[PDB]
Design a protein around this ligand. Structure first.
Ligand SMILES: NC(=O)c1ccc[n+]([C@@H]2O[C@H](COP(=O)([O-])OP(=O)(O)OC[C@H]3O[C@@H](n4cnc5c(N)ncnc54)[C@H](O)[C@@H]3O)[C@@H](O)[C@H]2O)c1
Ligand SMILES: NC(=O)c1ccc[n+]([C@@H]2O[C@H](COP(=O)([O-])OP(=O)(O)OC[C@H]3O[C@@H](n4cnc5c(N)ncnc54)[C@H](O)[C@@H]3O)[C@@H](O)[C@H]2O)c1
Ligand SMILES: Cc1cn([C@H]2C[C@H](O)[C@@H](COP(=O)(O)OP(=O)(O)O)O2)c(=O)[nH]c1=O
Ligand SMILES: Cc1cn([C@H]2C[C@H](O)[C@@H](COP(=O)(O)OP(=O)(O)O)O2)c(=O)[nH]c1=O
Ligand code: NI
Lengths: 319, 319
């Protein structure tokens, strides 16, 4: 399309690698620079490497390496997936979220502003944030709801700065928000792959608290397609929600995976301490992204988890 | 009320030193730990040193020094004024706002959470941030408007993190927002003291852009009083506006200070580049603070500036 050289931050990770493999198989003209710090949730084997795919090892906070990359590889598009992932009950956990999600995003934006040649800065965000739209003008966000935990506050803070680069300097940003993603290439510490891999290794499923927490789950293939559509067709400066209706509690998910595994839910569940923080996901609409022509292609959650269960059976040794 | 041992971040700066002197003068049994990095806008001469006031030199990002200070000095209250001030048109300027305003605030909140014995975390913010309430009667903020520049974006980011510590962990936070403050102890780089010191040093007044940008100006004595009142009587978790009706353009202010200096406006004014970013300030009310029993004691702007002009004549050699 209007993409020749793209910098995919976090391209060794779960969503980043799914996006990189989608672009490399759809658009054989596009040079893809995977920019990634290579931490434990990352894997070279997530990406189908070819003569278009190159790896740059670095932190998004590395101003000088980023400036070198944008100028020397003539980057037209940043696709920013490099957000912090690891949640735990230990002191300073949320600080790493601010350092990567707020400060790291900000370094990328300022580099982009100094470079001055970007055609698009695509920022990936989550349903931890709820953008309220102008009742006058539904293309326009006026406010974000107050996050209830510091993890979610770093996501809101990142979105405010990204948008401010467009409103102040005309940096060409687009933000997308996504539900919880499931699919191939996810390190098994998030619910679905952790439970699948636990069920494959004979072990019990850790239920934090009551197991009544609810998420919406969207397939990685539907996400990769939505991002592709928004990058190529989206209105610069706008935010796109990539939501589905596919809401399950933690216990609902345990039930489905136990059913797929041929084992009884009761005697698989071990109850474990709750997270210490307020953990609220928003139902986000998908009307704007549908008007771009996006259609959810993986609607049968049960059927997709059967396939993914078998994918981890073959591939989990990778992690 | 509750204040015995207080940690005042940025207490060598403009608003912080005015607050320290106020607490020292009004109470006789509050120990004040002035916590400050000693940047060029700070002065030890700003503080009236006594038996109850001690300087700890430190960055608010210094987790281990903060943790030693909270625990060994049995701090009950943090009064957090250490925000980044220095605006210019230079690359990377806004990055230091994220490091101090977002990451620094977050270090203080996480230290406070780990310490577990704070009675109050007071966060000083600005009229660059505006929030919307749930209902007139409950007056709880449920959203922040989207900021139009990255400077304001960092102030919004800080407020989201501060509030989330109350909402997730019951950290006892109060936020206050302020108009532009004027008074003693300000480094001459903000409008009023820069113009007063330029008039005294016989130099030209720099008008950035058109000089039609407007601010509201509140006296530091009125701000220190409001912060004391909010700390002792405010509802934990809420935000309070500290803000008068005292609106003036840059050119309105230049004219008042030229009149006071005994000089003609024409021939004092040099026109210099505008700031590169979009800056509009939300008009705030002071009803919530009036209900706690605050009353603006310094209402006569020109009268206060005549006195402030006199104070810089005597004391500006400090800077
Ligand atoms: N996974 C989900 O369910 C979900 C839901 C909504 C949207 N998102 C968004 O998707 C993006 C990626 O999520 P994911 O699940 O694929 O995560 P992941 O942890 O699998 O991938 C993140 C990648 O970024 C890299 N990284 C981390 N910090 C970095 C830094 N400072 N510099 C450079 N590289 C760094 C890691 O090495 C990793 O490869 C995030 O921006 C997040 O906001 C996540
Ligand atoms: N208005 C609000 O008023 C508050 C204070 O404004 P002001 O006009 O008095 O500012 P000022 O610039 O006059 O004072 C700020 C003080 O904070 C200190 N400081 C800055 N960054 C620091 C850091 N990382 N760690 C420790 N100390 C640090 C500076 O040395 C200075 O003494 C701000 O929070 C702002 O939101
Ligand atoms: C990984 C995991 C998650 N959970 C719960 C915590 C959350 O309510 C939910 C999803 O957690 P997780 O997959 O970590 O996702 P998120 O980043 O959206 O919080 O599953 C468990 O109960 N046990 C587990 O082993
Ligand atoms: C310091 C200064 C400010 N200004 C303008 C910039 C702003 O529009 C206004 C106030 O600036 P400033 O005092 O820096 O306050 P704020 O942090 O709220 O921006 O005065 C000048 O025109 N010349 C100057 O020399
Ligand atoms: Ni190179």
């Amino acid at each position: 399309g209007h993409m020749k050289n793209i910098l995919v931050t976090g391209g060794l990770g779960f969503i980043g690698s799914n996006f990189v493999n989608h672009i490399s198989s759809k658009y054989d003209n596009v040079n893809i620079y995977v920019y990634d710090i290579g931490d434990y949730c990352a894997s070279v084997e997530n990406v189908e490497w070819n003569n278009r795919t190159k790896l740059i090892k670095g932190d998004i906070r590395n101003f000088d390496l980023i400036m070198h990359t944008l100028t020397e590889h003539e980057i037209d598009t940043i696709v920013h997936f490099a957000a912090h992932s690891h949640v735990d009950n230990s002191f300073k956990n949320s600080l790493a979220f601010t350092e990567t999600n707020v400060f790291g995003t900000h370094v990328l934006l300022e580099c982009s502003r100094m470079y001055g040649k970007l055609k698009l800065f695509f920022h990936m965000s989550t349903d931890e944030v709820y953008g309220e739209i102008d009742t006058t003008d539904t293309s326009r966000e006026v406010s974000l709801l107050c996050p209830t935990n510091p993890y979610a506050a770093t996501k809101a803070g990142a979105e405010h700065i990204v948008k401010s680069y467009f409103l102040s300097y005309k940096l060409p940003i687009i933000i997308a928000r996504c539900n919880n993603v499931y699919g191939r290439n996810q390190y098994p510490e998030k619910l679905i792959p952790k439970f699948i891999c636990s069920l494959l290794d004979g072990k019990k499923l850790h239920i934090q608290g009551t197991g009544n927490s609810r998420r919406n789950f969207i397939h990685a293939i539907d996400v990769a397609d939505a991002v592709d559509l928004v990058i190529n067709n989206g209105v610069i400066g706008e935010t796109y929600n990539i939501g589905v209706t596919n809401e399950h509690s933690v216990l609902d998910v345990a039930q489905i995976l136990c059913d797929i595994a041929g084992v009884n839910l009761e005697n698989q569940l071990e109850y474990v301490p709750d997270r210490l923080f307020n953990d609220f996901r928003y139902n986000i609409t998908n009307d704007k992204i549908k008007s771009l022509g996006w259609e959810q292609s993986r609607k049968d959650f049960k059927k997709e988890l059967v396939e993914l269960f078998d994918w981890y059976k073959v591939n989990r040794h990778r992690y």
